[PDB]
Design a protein around this ligand. Structure first.
Ligand code: MG
Ligand code: MG
Ligand code: MG
Ligand code: MG
Ligand code: MG
Ligand code: MG
Ligand code: MG
Ligand code: MG
Ligand code: MG
Ligand code: MG
Ligand code: MG
Ligand code: MG
Ligand code: MG
Ligand code: MG
Ligand code: MG
Ligand code: MG
Ligand code: MG
Ligand code: MG
Ligand code: MG
Ligand code: MG
Ligand code: MG
Ligand code: MG
Ligand code: MG
Ligand code: MG
Ligand code: MG
Ligand code: MG
Ligand code: MG
Ligand code: MG
Ligand code: MG
Ligand code: MG
Ligand code: MG
Ligand code: MG
Ligand code: MG
Ligand code: MG
Ligand code: MG
Ligand code: MG
Ligand code: MG
Ligand code: MG
Ligand code: ZN
Lengths: 83, 97, 116, 23, 69, 181
RNA sequence: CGCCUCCUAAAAGGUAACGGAGGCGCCCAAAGGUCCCCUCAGGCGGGACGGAAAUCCGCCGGAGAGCGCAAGGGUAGAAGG
RNA sequence: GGCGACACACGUGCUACAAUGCCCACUACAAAGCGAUGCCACCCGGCAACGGGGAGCUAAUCGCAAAAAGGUGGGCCCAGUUCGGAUUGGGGUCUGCAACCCGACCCCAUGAAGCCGGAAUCGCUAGUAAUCGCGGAUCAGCCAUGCCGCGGUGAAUACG
């Protein structure tokens, strides 16, 4: 995965929205186009709306879903099986 | 198994299955119809049903053309039948001398 | 139930024999036999009950094993499946996990062929 | 073994180096 | 007991790998076992064998704090 | 009678601790072990190699006592069972032998169980007896790998003079039966 | 179409109809004699494989089980094992 | 975001099922090409990917570089294995603004199918086939087991 030497990557433009929410006293739904962003320990408890290419999918974040990316919880593909 | 390619056209599972039904006419001769391929297409003047099939005694390669697709599929089958039958009985033609 | 829980094949070289424990490859095998100071060439059937208890004692304490390892791997997938992440989902369908193609192949995850 | 990365033979084929094939 | 159908019970020493020795009775005088109540993890208070982790995951990742506020 | 360590442990350590813990007014009211009844429900020997003389042997080594055979009360279809067929063994350990068995079960056997995480707290009767099932007989010090043809488990009943589950727990726990929760 | 069991059959016996329902034409060398011993089905709880039901442990359980076969009578203070 | 979907079907290939083989170690013999935010000797950290140093070279000078099969020695002993390397868990490295979908690589662990393949069917007549490795275009990286080349070792058989 991303190299330990370099950062733990978050788009800066979401981190701000996250930080702004901590201070003012949380919390509202946060639309984003950042499937690439890591979920970060300060994101826990939010419910972030992740774009999949069609919808912004609501994802409530938990302490167990921390190091993962955002897009891991907003499926890109519709599949109900064959025939 | 059974393979149909519909070229620059949209066709239904209904139509697909109908092709399987027609092609079945070949099962008459009781020889292995190996990996048969039906190709359906639409020229300006009408449809085309192409097919290439390998059997233990050779290959069936033929083509039907008609204003009507269903009719083209049939005309294909005729040619396939004729060839298949030539394969199956040509060997008998020289048991004397 | 020799070491640890499993009875490692006699007749064979102890370095190969130790591989017959879940969670111990070529590598971990090379490592136990140095740390307990015994010849990897010796057949298991030729081990001092001493050399054995050493081997046993080290390995059982150094590395997570047999059932206890499988439990973690299950627990690992357990959670991945329940947080509902994509790698979790692929498990949830028995499908491939590592971004492989599924238009053809993919048989080891799927099972042998399932006719339409 | 050309498909077993964990051997010499494996790494020559993959075009790489490592523990099992050093440089 | 009925004669001739029952294996004899004699004083017997069960020797464990911890180096424990048990004075008991068996149909075999000397036995060597790989484990016992004296050295088994579940028995030995709560000897957390190999995995004294405290999970460790996942809040407990911590590499690092270097993303900014 | 034999001096066997666990037997003595009962009279020395467990006896009194129990009288403390529940306050009995009578020497006979305090919980005793009555019998340990070991059963191999088997029937993997229904027809096949109905030589389970092999198992009767194994049990006879473990308990120091030769089991007697059990046979089916009624004929049963789906298990392939004609009435009168040898499907099980049962050896009834009492007194000294019961103690000797329990000693090794507690000291050596249960330790040797794969992924052993403690006996089951809930396997109690409600009239104060305990039952527990083994998956293999390699658990006992007497049975080596070398000598076994095929893995077979067993049922162990441990029968107490206790009237209640709560009392019987104390007895077995104090004797050293490891309970998980 | 002979034989057995129940009902009809009107509380002794008997009692008809092309009245209502079922069985027999065998079997068992033990499934016979005798001595000794043993007691069921079923319910709840507990117990590796093991399940509604295999075998084991506990409690309750007079007989509802068993008794070669139909039915009836009998029957564990045994006719049952 | 998709082109990477996955009840299925077909074509092309890779790697195998092993002892004329597999692993470890030591040791040989090519050719064609490529190379200035480019190839990178040599030293250092790290099991390693790689990281840090840092010399040379507009290159018949300097580098990619080790060719591999081969040779010597040592293990495996016919076992789904010291065959095979799929799948999965975990830990890392690098490119890149960014590796969830969806990169490659490394290491621990996992260690599938597969015991030579029905009907059918392909290639090749000599430095060919078979087997073995190396380069290049594209290109940040790379899903290349593809393609275009290059040598190494080196057969069988043709009545007709
Ligand atoms: Mg044409
Ligand atoms: Mg292993
Ligand atoms: Mg891929
Ligand atoms: Mg895919
Ligand atoms: Mg290459
Ligand atoms: Mg209970
Ligand atoms: Mg009791
Ligand atoms: Mg044993
Ligand atoms: Mg008569
Ligand atoms: Mg009457
Ligand atoms: Mg009457
Ligand atoms: Mg009357
Ligand atoms: Mg009257
Ligand atoms: Mg009269
Ligand atoms: Mg008799
Ligand atoms: Mg009688
Ligand atoms: Mg008699
Ligand atoms: Mg009962
Ligand atoms: Mg029950
Ligand atoms: Mg069960
Ligand atoms: Mg039961
Ligand atoms: Mg009755
Ligand atoms: Mg009858
Ligand atoms: Mg895309
Ligand atoms: Mg494409
Ligand atoms: Mg196929
Ligand atoms: Mg390929
Ligand atoms: Mg290049
Ligand atoms: Mg295997
Ligand atoms: Mg197989
Ligand atoms: Mg192997
Ligand atoms: Mg291998
Ligand atoms: Mg073989
Ligand atoms: Mg072949
Ligand atoms: Mg081959
Ligand atoms: Mg093949
Ligand atoms: Mg090869
Ligand atoms: Mg490239
Ligand atoms: Zn011990």
């Amino acid at each position: 995965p991303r190299s330990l030497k370099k950062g733990v990557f978050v788009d800066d433009h979401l981190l701000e929205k996250v930080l702004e929410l901590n201070a003012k006293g949380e919390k509202r739904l946060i639309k984003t186009w950042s499937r690439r962003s890591t979920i970060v320990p300060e994101m826990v408890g939010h419910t972030i709306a992740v774009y999949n290419g069609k919808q912004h999918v609501p994802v409530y974040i938990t302490e167990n879903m921390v190091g993962h990316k955002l897009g891991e919880f907003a499926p890109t593909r519709t599949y109900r099986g064959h025939g | 198994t059974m393979n149909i390619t519909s070229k620059q056209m949209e066709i239904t599972p209904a139509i697909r299955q109908h092709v399987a039904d027609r092609l079945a006419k070949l099962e008459k001769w009781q020889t292995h119809l190996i990996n048969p391929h039906i190709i359906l297409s639409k020229e300006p003047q009408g449809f085309v049903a192409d097919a290439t099939i390998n059997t233990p005694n050779g290959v069936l390669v033929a083509s039907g053309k008609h204003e009507d697709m269903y009719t083209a599929i049939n005309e294909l089958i005729n040619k396939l039948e004729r060839q298949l039958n030539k394969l199956q009985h040509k060997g008998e033609a020289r048991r004397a001398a | 139930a020799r070491i640890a829980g499993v009875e490692i094949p006699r007749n064979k070289r102890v370095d190969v024999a130790l591989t017959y424990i879940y969670g111990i490859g070529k590598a971990r095998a090379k490592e136990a036999l140095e740390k307990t100071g015994i010849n990897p060439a010796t057949r298991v059937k030729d081990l001092t009950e001493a050399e054995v208890v050493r081997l046993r004692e080290y390995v059982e304490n150094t590395w997570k094993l047999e059932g206890e390892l499988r439990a973690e791997v299950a627990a690992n997938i357990k959670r991945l499946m329940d947080i509902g992440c994509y790698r979790g989902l692929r498990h949830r369908r028995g499908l491939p996990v590592r971004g492989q193609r599924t238009r053809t192949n993919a048989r080891t995850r799927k099972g042998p062929r399932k006719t339409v | 073994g050309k498909g077993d990365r964990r051997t010499r033979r494996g790494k020559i084929w993959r075009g790489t180096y490592g523990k099992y094939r050093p440089r | 007991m009925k004669e001739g159908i029952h294996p004899k019970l004699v004083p017997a020493r069960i020797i464990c790998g911890c180096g424990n020795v048990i004075e008991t009775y068996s149909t075999k005088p000397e036995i060597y076992v790989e484990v016992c109540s004296k050295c088994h993890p579940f028995y030995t208070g709560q000897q957390r064998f190999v995995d004294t982790e405290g999970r460790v995951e996942r809040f407990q990742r911590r590499y690092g704090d270097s993303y900014r506020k | 009678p034999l001096d066997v360590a666990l037997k003595r442990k009962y009279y020395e350590e467990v006896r009194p601790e129990l009288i403390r813990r529940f306050g009995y007014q009578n020497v006979w009211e305090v919980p005793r072990l009555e019998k340990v009844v070991i059963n191999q429900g088997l029937g993997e020997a229904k027809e096949d190699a109905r030589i389970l003389e092999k198992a009767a042997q194994e049990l006879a080594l473990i308990t120091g006592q030769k089991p007697a055979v059990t046979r089916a009360k009624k004929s049963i279809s789906n298990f392939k069972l004609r009435k009168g067929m040898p499907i099980g063994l049962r050896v009834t350990l009492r007194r000294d032998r019961m103690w000797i068995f329990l000693e090794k079960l507690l000291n050596v056997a249960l330790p040797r169980i794969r992924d052993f995480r403690g006996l089951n707290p809930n396997s109690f009767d409600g009239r104060g007896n305990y039952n527990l099932g083994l998956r293999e007989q390699l658990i006992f010090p007497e049975i080596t790998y070398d000598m076994v043809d095929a893995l077979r488990g067993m049922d162990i009943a441990v029968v107490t003079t206790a009237e209640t589950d709560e009392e019987a727990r104390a007895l077995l726990e104090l004797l050293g039966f490891p309970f998980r929760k």
